[PDB]
């Protein structure tokens, strides 16, 4: 809602920061196994459940 | 080119509904060049954007 | 060739027992087919004024008879598939009306 | 790459192929079956007519519930046929690629004919539907691999 | 009736375990070959012989067999024609074959000598009230 607590807003900010693709240069690292961000979230697919 | 942004901004500036905004069909290129409400006001003054009765 | 003629199109018989919600669009298609047959041009353009006249009485009340002017003109665009196209516009109804009016050649 | 059938004289032949094309496998198979051994120009004209709804692709193997038309009479007596525009568009694009390859090779296009053409099932892509009583069902596509070779007659 | 009422409810018993040819089924209707018997000929109109016209002894009005406005969907009858009692197979314009009777016609109906008294020629494309176009024109004051 428009009315939200400070703690919930900070948690949402962290969740937004965590919702991004991996840097391209990560794939060039020696002995790299990470292909993409497996923890990507979409607001319509999976709810945060707060 | 799409003029949806221009239509919305003209509706806001003219204080009318979006269905009462007239965008000159022959001035599409120069209307599309406007992306700020100042440009929309200039176009309205120039007569390329009109509020329909 | 470049030829202009004015026709009277009997839409009433061509739209007999047409479903109401598709009568006027069917009238537009009917006029397009008529132009195609008369001028032999696949690409037919209907003037906005003629479209207004067809729709002037709603989606049901298409006029029984409509007088139109069909002009076959060369298509200047090089990318166009067809060399010629037909333009259908409204035509002036004489004072005596449509009775006794046949097909006319308009080009001077 | 190795094709299913190699030309008898590769020097006088050209090839083109596509993988995981987003078109129905069965319609594509029907049109490919319609095109086999036909001369290149006749194939192009036939596919153009199919796109114009003037000639029909006879549906022969995957034909259960397919309508019938008078257009396919000469090829399929029972009249079962359709006008799959997507498959003919893709096959026409592949034929154009093969013709360009032949032009690069120096072959003369007049006597070219479709020596071989084959359609294989590619990997299926997954979607889903919602059914009565809170159920979910598969909603899959059937992309296909297409390869063809053009050879010089005689 | 759930699932429609224009049906045969029971199309067969359990045994024999097959639908028989004697049960009514939906299919083609019409366009069937037929042979109808005993259609009497009431008159034989010969072109240009005064028998082609619909004039009778009782009714002396000068008129032709073709009704006002023409025969609907057919046209104008000008050649020889047969006027047959009752109806015949097919729609208008359908070619029909005429066959000599295969039976011996000795009944009173077959031997009857029919004498036409009036032949209606009013328009059949509506509730025709005039027998001739001249009559209508006189009625409306245009003749």
């Amino acid at each position: 809602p428009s009315h939200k607590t400070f703690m919930i807003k900070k948690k949402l900010a962290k969740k937004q920061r965590q919702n991004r693709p991996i840097p391209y240069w990560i794939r060039m690292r020696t002995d790299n196994t990470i292909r993409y961000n497996a923890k990507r979230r979409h607001w319509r697919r999976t709810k945060l459940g707060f | 080119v799409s003029l949806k942004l221009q239509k919305r901004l003209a509706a806001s500036v003219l204080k009318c509904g979006r269905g009462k905004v007239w965008l000159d069909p022959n001035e599409g290129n120069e209307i599309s060049m406007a992306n700020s409400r100042q440009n929309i006001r200039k176009l309205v003054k120039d007569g390329f954007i009109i509020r329909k009765p | 060739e470049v030829v202009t003629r004015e026709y009277t199109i009997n839409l009433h018989k061509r739209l007999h027992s047409c479903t109401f919600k598709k009568k006027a669009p069917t009238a537009i298609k009917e006029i397009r087919k008529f132009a195609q047959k008369a001028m032999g041009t696949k690409d037919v353009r209907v003037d906005v004024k003629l479209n207004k006249q067809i729709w002037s009485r709603g989606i049901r009340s298409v006029p029984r008879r409509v007088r139109v002017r069909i002009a076959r003109k060369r298509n200047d665009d090089e990318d166009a598939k067809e060399e010629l196209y037909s333009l259908v516009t409204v035509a002036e109804i004489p004072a005596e009306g449509l009775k006794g009016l046949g097909t006319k050649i308009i080009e001077d | 790459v190795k094709y299913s059938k190699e030309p008898d004289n590769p020097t006088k032949s050209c090839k083109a192929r596509g993988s995981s094309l987003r078109v129905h496998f069965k319609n594509t198979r029907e049109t490919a079956h319609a095109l086999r051994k036909m001369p290149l120009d006749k194939a192009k004209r036939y596919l153009e007519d199919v796109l114009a709804h003037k000639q029909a692709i006879p549906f022969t193997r995957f034909c259960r519930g397919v309508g019938r038309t008078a257009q396919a009479k000469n090829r399929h007596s029972s009249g079962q046929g359709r006008w799959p525009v997507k498959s003919t568009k893709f096959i026409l694009d592949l034929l154009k690629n093969a013709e360009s390859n032949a032009d690069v090779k120096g072959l003369d296009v007049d006597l070219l004919f479709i020596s071989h053409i084959q359609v294989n099932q590619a990997q299926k892509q997954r979607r889903r539907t919602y059914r009565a009583h809170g159920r979910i069902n598969p909603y899959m596509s059937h992309p296909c691999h297409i390869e063809l070779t053009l050879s010089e007659k005689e | 009736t759930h699932r429609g009422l224009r049906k045969v409810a029971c199309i067969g018993a359990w045994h024999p375990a097959r639908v028989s040819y004697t049960v009514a089924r939906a299919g083609q209707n019409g366009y069937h070959h037929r042979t109808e018997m005993n259609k009497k000929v009431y008159k034989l109109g010969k072109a240009g012989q005064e028998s082609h016209a619909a004039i009778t002894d009782f009714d002396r009005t000068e008129k032709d067999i073709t009704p006002m406005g023409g025969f609907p969907h057919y046209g104008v009858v000008k050649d020889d024609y047969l006027l047959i009692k009752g109806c015949c197979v097919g729609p208008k314009k359908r070619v029909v074959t005429l066959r000599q009777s295969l039976l011996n016609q000795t009944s009173r109906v077959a031997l009857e000598e029919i004498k036409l008294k009036f032949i209606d020629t009013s328009s059949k494309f509506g509730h025709g009230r005039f027998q001739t176009t001249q009559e209508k024109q006189k009625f409306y004051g245009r003749l």
Binding site: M7, I8, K11, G49, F50 | - | - | - | -
Partner: protein, 86 residues
């Protein structure tokens, strides 16, 4: 009406985030956490759920202080001294 229609009414949160364990297990009206029993002093743990115990046992977190204890033990908790100057 007890199925799809009833699910349309879900806008009152029985639980919110717990201050202690961070789970969405803090029962607002009871004012206690169904996962860790905050604000009770002792943590809520039971032997009939070995999986629940291993999800939250020591070592699953950071061990900010504990991780360094063995190193200090190996030196006998040496303190107030430094290596000889170079």
């Amino acid at each position: 009406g007890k199925g799809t229609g009833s699910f349309g009414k879900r806008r009152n949160k029985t639980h919110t985030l717990c201050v202690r364990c961070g789970r969405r297990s803090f029962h607002i009206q009871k004012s206690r956490c169904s996962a860790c029993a905050y604000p009770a002093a002792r943590l809520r743990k039971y032997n009939w759920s070995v999986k629940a115990l291993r999800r939250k046992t020591t070592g699953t977190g950071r061990m900010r202080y504990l991780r360094n204890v063995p190193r200090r033990f190996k030196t006998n908790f040496r303190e107030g001294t430094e290596a000889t100057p170079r």
